[PDB]
Amino acid sequence: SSDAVIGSIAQGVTDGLTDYLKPRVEELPAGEVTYPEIAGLPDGVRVISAEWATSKHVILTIQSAAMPERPIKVQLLLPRDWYSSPNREFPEIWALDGLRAIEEQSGWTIETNIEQYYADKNAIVVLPVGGESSFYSDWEGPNNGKNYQWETFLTQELAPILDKGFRSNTDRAITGISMGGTAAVNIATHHPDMFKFVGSFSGYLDTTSAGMPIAISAALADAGGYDANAMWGPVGSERWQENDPKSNVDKLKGKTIYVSSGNVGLEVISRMTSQTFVDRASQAGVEVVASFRPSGVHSWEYWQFEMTQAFPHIANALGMSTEDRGVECAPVGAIADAVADGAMGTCLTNEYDVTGGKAQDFANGRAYWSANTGAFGLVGRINARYSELGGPASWLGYPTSSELKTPDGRGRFVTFEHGSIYWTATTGPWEIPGDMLAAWGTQDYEKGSLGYPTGAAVEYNGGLRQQFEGGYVFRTSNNQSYWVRGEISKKYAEDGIFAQLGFPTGNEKLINGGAFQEFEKGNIYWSASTGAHVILHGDIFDAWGAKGWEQGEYGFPTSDQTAITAGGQTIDFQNGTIRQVNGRIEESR
Incomplete structure (x- = not known):
């Protein structure tokens, strides 16, 4: 099974490998625009505009230094007590999209009830928009008409904006699905003090092991036609070793870590990489919470389910109070329909x-x-x-x-x-x-x-x-x-x-x-x-x-x-x- 999918890729089968992650094209709802002025940002970096889809869902348009060609949209879901406690600061929970992320909106809010789930919780949910195949990394060079410096944008530009402009304490949990899951771990290993929690939902936590590269290339191939060489360079280079979760796990000692996989090709690869990742963590003596359980729910509903499974551990890592956490659990699929x-x-x-x-x-x-x-x-x-x-x-x-x-x-x-x-x-x-x-x-x-x-x-x-x-x-x-x-x-x-x-x-x-x-x-x-x-x-x-x-x-x-x-x-x-x-x-x- 694991060998069969790697095999299909090696025989030049890519067409359809990423289709299971393609979200509906949904435009964010129109809203009142404000023009926040944030003092102390780096050169070139400012918030062009903040559009309020709702009083609790605000869309930032940011001028990036690292990615200046055009602006970057980033959705915030604002904590329950945003207005009721206007002097309070909140922790950050980053929800990184999957391979087929579209420019129109974060897949999370298109395909899941994450808006409803977090409504009753005191945390700022950060959902960066677009970046198809980016793996939220700093690419060696430009490729396919895009130039990706996402890791810099996220850690060096967005992080300050939220700290200064959006009442954030430095306390962060970084999570994501697919490339977002990979990125979540990579980014955490690169900046181990910026995060207290790391979450990979159906991510690829092994990039260097024999045949893994041929897949990650097949992935970027199908997911808009990008070249992995452009991203991390030659198929063995110091950039691949730098962005290989299973290798770097030892650098996450002290952190709450959540790894999920199961719910065809790429899910199989994710299950293997995730297993290899947990195996290498146990060896490093780094405690990880694993979820390889079967479920009656698949894809987006499944990923949101894993979010809610992780949240209690997120809340623990970020030290949120009981009164902050709201209703932690949420019915899904057939049980949800019968409990209506x-x-x-x-x-x-x-x-x-x-x-x-x-x-x-x-x-x-x-x-x-x-x-x-x-x-x-x-x-x-x-x-x-x-x-x-x-x-x-x-x-x-x-x-x-x-x-x-x-x-x-x-x-x-x-x-x-x-x-x-x-x-x-x-x-x-x-x-x-x-x-x-x-x-x-x-x-x-x-x-x-x-x-x-x-x-x-x-x-x-x-x-x-x-x-x-x-x-x-x-x-x-x-x-x-x-x-x-x-x-x-x-x-x-x-x-x-x-x-x-x-x-x-x-x-x-x-x-x-x-x-x-x-x-x-x-x-x-x-x-x-x-x-x-x-x-x-x-x-x-x-x-x-x-x-x-x-x-x-x-x-x-x-x-x-x-x-x-x-x-x-x-x-x-x-x-x-x-x-x-x-x-x-x-x-x-």
């Missing part, structure tokens, strides 16, 4: 991996998702039980519904892959295995005598017995499901009765005059008058059979078939008695 009601409340955590898929904590309960089942938010006592069991780790599998109401309006239930959980204020939350559930169904679930489960399916004589309001449901030693109800049920559960009958072979059947149920080794018969009484398979039964059982002369049993002497066995009926004494059937009325 607002029912679940404020999220307490992000999507985290559970066995078959993902789970997310909320104020009011937990949400669950798998590619198969989809996403559902569960609340209250049902959810409290589903958790007690281990959520999708437990035999139930993933939820196939949210909390549903029963037509009697006193019950609530949730459906799962391999069962259901039912709840009432008085019975509690209980899980019924799918097979036992279908059996309970034959009697019409909660609508029938049995009502609601009152406990869990437990070990019963090499089978399962779950108690209900109206009786019990069973899983037989031969893996079938039958239920037992009312007066027959009271009997079946009595001391020593199971010993005689074994598991049911069918459910209760209503007959003229009462009802009966069939068991492995006998039958239970019940009527209003007689009660529930056991008859066993054998001579007495066959004889009673010859005379129409309970419908015929003798009627319903009025006592349990009990043993007398050596082989002696009797059982009373309504209108007679049948024995089998000394091997013989004795039909006495």
Whole structure:
């Protein structure tokens, strides 16, 4: 896989390698322009104009010394308390775009909800615009009608502007995706005091290792047709070694570092480089937070997800207070769509991996998702039980519904892959295995005598017995499901009765005059008058059979078939008695 992509590139396949990073062409919204005058900037450097898309999203147009030909646009997302605390200073969080960055706007604000995410947070988000393929570096020379001195522009010109003009403390976190991820680490290793945190989302953290250069060239080739020689020079030179994260990792000792990859060619290369990077960090004894986890979200939504995953570590590195951080976590993809009601409340955590898929904590309960089942938010006592069991780790599998109401309006239930959980204020939350559930169904679930489960399916004589309001449901030693109800049920559960009958072979059947149920080794018969009484398979039964059982002369049993002497066995009926004494059937009325 890793070798196959490097291979395709070596065979001259570049076309389409960077398309997965191409953002929508969206123009920033029009706004009130101001002309800030900043004292103490370097020669040639000033802020031409500040346009306010919103009161919290301001676009700077900067006159660069290092890049003078035309101006550089840089988006700021201003902290929550910008106006409410007008004397306060804030930390900087730099969000560097990917290979296919367009001049019109930062990919981050085109393709993600980063505007909304940071709205409630006390930090200045810096989002430099344009610079396709720049890798935010100082190129050896000009190329492809552009001259890139981005590393200088960022560290030597923009950094002062924000420090002087935009109420910034020097405290910075530098992050980015794709070339931005590479750049984030390169720039941090070059200026280790300017940053307290470094973040690479799906970046290329290895530029020197055999075949890496042929890829980085293929990248600049596809991403507008740039020449890597123009950027860092000959394919071995001191400029490549200078811009190779895996080599330089040792220079980031003391810093919070975040590395993500996974979510085709270039993502594969990023996964390898990121792995090599973490490997070399561990060797250097530099702690790094790695994220190679799978996700149901891809590209832009995925990258913004990783941003929110990193933010708590950013906040730690920049020493932001709890009240500064706002709501750190944010729902994405299918869980986000299912939580849109607002029912679940404020999220307490992000999507985290559970066995078959993902789970997310909320104020009011937990949400669950798998590619198969989809996403559902569960609340209250049902959810409290589903958790007690281990959520999708437990035999139930993933939820196939949210909390549903029963037509009697006193019950609530949730459906799962391999069962259901039912709840009432008085019975509690209980899980019924799918097979036992279908059996309970034959009697019409909660609508029938049995009502609601009152406990869990437990070990019963090499089978399962779950108690209900109206009786019990069973899983037989031969893996079938039958239920037992009312007066027959009271009997079946009595001391020593199971010993005689074994598991049911069918459910209760209503007959003229009462009802009966069939068991492995006998039958239970019940009527209003007689009660529930056991008859066993054998001579007495066959004889009673010859005379129409309970419908015929003798009627319903009025006592349990009990043993007398050596082989002696009797059982009373309504209108007679049948024995089998000394091997013989004795039909006495």
